[PDB]
Amino acid sequence: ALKDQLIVNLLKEEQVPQNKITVVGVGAVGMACAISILMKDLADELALVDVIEDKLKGEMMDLQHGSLFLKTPKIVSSKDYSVTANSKLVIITAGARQQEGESRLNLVQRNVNIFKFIIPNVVKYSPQCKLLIVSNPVDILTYVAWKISGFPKNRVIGSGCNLDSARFRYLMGERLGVHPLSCHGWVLGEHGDSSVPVWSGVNVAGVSLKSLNPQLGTDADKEQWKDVHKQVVDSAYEVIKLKGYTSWAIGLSVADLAESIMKNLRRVHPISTMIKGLYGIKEDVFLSVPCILGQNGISDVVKVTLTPDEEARLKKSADTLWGIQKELQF
Amino acid sequence: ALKDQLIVNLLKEEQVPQNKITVVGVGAVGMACAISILMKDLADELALVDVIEDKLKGEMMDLQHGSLFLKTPKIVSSKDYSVTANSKLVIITAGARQQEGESRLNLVQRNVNIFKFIIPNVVKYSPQCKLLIVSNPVDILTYVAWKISGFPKNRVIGSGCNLDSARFRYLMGERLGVHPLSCHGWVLGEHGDSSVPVWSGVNVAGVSLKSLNPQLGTDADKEQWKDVHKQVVDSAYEVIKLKGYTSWAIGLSVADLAESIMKNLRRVHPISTMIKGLYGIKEDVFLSVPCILGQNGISDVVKVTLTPDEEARLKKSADTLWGIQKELQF
Amino acid sequence: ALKDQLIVNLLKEEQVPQNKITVVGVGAVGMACAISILMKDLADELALVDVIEDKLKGEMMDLQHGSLFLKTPKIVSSKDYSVTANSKLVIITAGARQQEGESRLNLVQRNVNIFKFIIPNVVKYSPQCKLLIVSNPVDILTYVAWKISGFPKNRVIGSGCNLDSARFRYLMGERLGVHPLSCHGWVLGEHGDSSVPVWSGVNVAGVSLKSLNPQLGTDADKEQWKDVHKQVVDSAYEVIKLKGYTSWAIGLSVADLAESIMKNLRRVHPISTMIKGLYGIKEDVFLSVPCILGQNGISDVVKVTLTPDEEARLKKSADTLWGIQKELQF
Amino acid sequence: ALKDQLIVNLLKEEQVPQNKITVVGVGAVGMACAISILMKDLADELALVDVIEDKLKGEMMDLQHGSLFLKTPKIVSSKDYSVTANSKLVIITAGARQQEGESRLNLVQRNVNIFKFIIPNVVKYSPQCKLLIVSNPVDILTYVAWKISGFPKNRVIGSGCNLDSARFRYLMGERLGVHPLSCHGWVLGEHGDSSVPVWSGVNVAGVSLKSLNPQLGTDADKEQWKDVHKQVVDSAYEVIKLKGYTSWAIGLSVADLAESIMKNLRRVHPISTMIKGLYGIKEDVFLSVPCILGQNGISDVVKVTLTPDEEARLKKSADTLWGIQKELQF
């Protein structure tokens, strides 16, 4: 053979991936996560899983054909979860998505039923994995993945408000003529209608915008900064109305979280975690709060000092999510 | 105003972008080019153009929402070509796309008609840009763009065989257990069925594979390496059959060419250029040959020493393209 | 020639760089700036300038030999400023550096005299550049370069407190077990002994550390956070005492600023600019305040809301700089 | 405590890094390797070791101060090898370095003696690491590290001719007006005076320069291409004469090898390995040949088809190295 004429093999050794990532679901979101992760050089192996065989193989081959321009030497796919073996991170993007005028909370029964199959199959082959939930309603589905997997809470993360906060900062950036990287602001709670803009923490270079305009974020605000939070809430629906779905922003948001996990960065992100014991919440509610994210998932939670109005809005978001959690049939 | 309370403006300057890129066409190819360029930090401004207003706005908004995770501070879109002003590079991905079980040659007249509208509009707003043609059949459309624009040939580039060669190197790499970056081989001529694998230049670490297998790539090859080029030819048809279209690998190939142009790298790429005068070709035929690509587009061509077999196949590829091209009225 | 047998030239080589950067001074700082800029792919051309012939050629050759691993196709050097023609950014690192126990303020006479030769020569060849002053005392030298250059104040930037703030954020991060990217804190005023830690703006996820611990940064603080600012002030002295000079951190801080300039990011950095008109300062003092930094240099200044002690400390830093600056002759 | 008022801790992590790199030696080479690895985001932990206490601490602090600008969350140092525990890759740059006009072979006993202390201490703390030898004479010291470590040969790698080949490609690129990435050429054997330029494999786009010029690299060559190899051999001596040492190019060359190892790329590099069984070599000689480099180090060797003259020159390089190698006291 030409291979043996050209190359002398010196080592037999069984190859075990060291920084493997799995993406479950090859819809627009799953593929946006995959291309973003590949272009950020976060993985030494990428596995794709779906139930539609042709689409799955087609997507895998299309990524494989770009290998010369990448630094991820193995891209694989299968409907069989054995392909995901030894993942450090498993990203779940499978399930139904909301129609215009439909709440993400309406996807709950359909997506729980799918998670009942996916979750046990994913965890089986990857003892060192963190579970990163993207599927909606993300907060509820992070709780569901946590309950089905039996994993400790640090290992089950929802993409949550990482995207809502990126959108908030983009919009704040546009109003101020500043890059979103230098515009600070947190959108917490449900990744959905009940999200909470933390006006008290909105700042540029440590300068609180609320301290310059005490009415910031209220109906009495002359500049109507509340409209920025409304644009954040409505963003998925606006994009869905225009292009049919959303993909790029969520893909970049998920790759941002994959980077903190894979590189053990210990950066702070507003992502879905269990909040029992904070802000008077006595139940096993998952929602976004600022979390320290690294190689073991969420190791620490930042205790945000909220005003009584912000805390009441966060509790209202938690009560909404808890109500849906009470509807779950395991 | 809150902005004026927070920030002292010292310079009111709109200012022209210095490294602007425009992508014409927001289909799967155009958006894969867009995301790949964004993730490679090649531009300070990205402009998107299309005729479907809602689709265009939603795509632009979806990219804008990931701004926090990027280093391209301005993303704009319009059906109006005024949005493309001062582009250094304009990438054309618009038109009818290759269909299941159909040649790229079947899209020719429809895409020539679309180019009669696009090209003068691009030229009006960026008369000094480099045009990068991606739309199929790419070799013919690069010639078409060249004739319509009135630009010198160096500034009209076709993505051509940059992807066919990347596919070839991926497949060669899989066979040898070597990264495609270390597997060298060139696929020239038409970006399509009549492409030419240059078996005489196929090598690893300067070791000619043909020196180890004299029959390499011929019918008489005991290992049938011609099947690797057959896989290269068939790739888009297989991917289209499986997922409906191709996008990821072409987006990466296009970003690879955008990088050499924007960064004046002078790397060698197999891309579409006028081959009149080489290998006995006497007509204004465009096809892929290895070109030096930089800030002024194609400045030089590498003269590959083709074997009589390879030269015959390249002449045949040129004949197939000219045949279609001569019966073109514009 | 072999070149003409291999390559057919199709275009006359009138090469003019599009993103050229010049580094003046090839001491440890200049070279750390050069390597960091090369590794961030910020330039299509890198020019080096110094007065020591051998050292300059050796440094240029050593960078050139790494070209295969870089995306900066042209690296040049000369004592002659003609080599710096058409730069978009010129970084000044030339001049005397402080000994152990010597203030940066003591370098002023030597460095002003050097700037009288360097500054007109830089502007003569790069009329479109932004000037990035690194040489010490940076704040006074930014004012000096501005007066000599004839450039508008937005185009004359001092690296200032971009490094002091990065040191502050690293130390804060270490104490909290959070990445410095998520630890916000500003050190303003002189890049030297009179720098001001803005305790009121110190936060993680918008949570003010001063609101949690009112004693923060005072002598009554049980955790002695004032020692963090003391370590910031003493950093250069401590590192000089240990390794003889500093290079890596300043190199990275300068590359960070070069990135915001070259990519027009409009990120906020604490850098040297004219502060006359703010905090009751009436003289042409330059010092660090948070600035919006982009393609036209400093376009805007953020008005930080300082506590009475922080403001008095900032005014005192301005007085210190003015006491040295008022006695200058150039 | 402030940390506790701000953050709720969820778990006590293992804190064992997953992509740890150690650099032994904080001289100019060691630090250039350190900065290049840090800027390529290859590690989650970087450890530095040296015998000069002050210089070690100063260097570690200077890197730490740039953390905000990096993605390597932990940078540590100590004279004690306990700091190197669980490294995937250990890079040895320690020992005597060449003075002006000094042969690398002259450093042999001083470096073998130093390696007698270093190697057992590295093996004790990371028994599963890959060893990457940079210290000179690199080929002999890779043999020394292999014998002392007791490691299998795949895990003991010398930087060898990776830099010599990069210099060759830079020089070839400058002559042709092509980026070194598109210029292919291999320098094998000793990383020193007896290195071998493989003229038969020198090409651009698979076009052999020797096929165009049959006298390429000989005394009869009109363009004197042999001078390119002479420039390669003389490079380190020329740079040492000018700046006192070399650092940048070797640092980039080392980070390139580190990248193939850490990311399991399986790229081909000309690096030091055991060549027993090839080209008539019957002894445990280490020298540069093209190697497939990945997560398990050197898994395979490419068999280069050398001409009788090229093979005699390689056997000459082998004989020269073995002469010293066979009589080592350790």
Ligand SMILES: Cc1nc2ccc(NC(=O)CCNC(N)=O)cc2s1
């Ligand atoms: C039992 C099941 N396992 C899977 C695995 C993947 C998918 N794939 C998607 O749902 C992709 C399309 N959806 C979005 N939102 O992109 C569905 C199922 S059903």
Ligand SMILES: Cc1nc2ccc(NC(=O)CCNC(N)=O)cc2s1
């Ligand atoms: C006169 C015309 N101007 C344009 C501009 C853009 C597009 N857009 C596409 O064709 C995108 C979808 N097609 C592929 N190939 O992705 C069509 C036209 S028609």
Ligand SMILES: Cc1nc2ccc(NC(=O)CCNC(N)=O)cc2s1
């Ligand atoms: C009229 C003059 N033009 C120059 C240009 C460069 C340098 N070079 C340095 O000073 C580098 C070493 N200094 C530090 N601080 O790194 C000195 C002079 S004097």
Ligand SMILES: Cc1nc2ccc(NC(=O)CCNC(N)=O)cc2s1
């Ligand atoms: C027993 C010993 N262990 C070590 C460890 C590190 C170093 N450090 C250097 O040699 C750095 C300076 N030299 C070059 N080549 O950069 C020397 C020794 S001696």
Ligand SMILES: COc1ccc(CC(C(=O)O)C(=O)O)cc1OC
């Ligand atoms: C699994 O499907 C999705 C998950 C999240 C998003 C992100 C989206 C949303 O939450 O609806 C958004 O906010 O843009 C979109 C998805 O399908 C298109």
Ligand SMILES: COc1ccc(CC(C(=O)O)C(=O)O)cc1OC
């Ligand atoms: C031009 O010389 C320098 C400019 C800035 C620094 C940065 C340094 C300082 O300001 O002394 C620091 O803070 O590390 C160091 C220099 O030479 C060693």
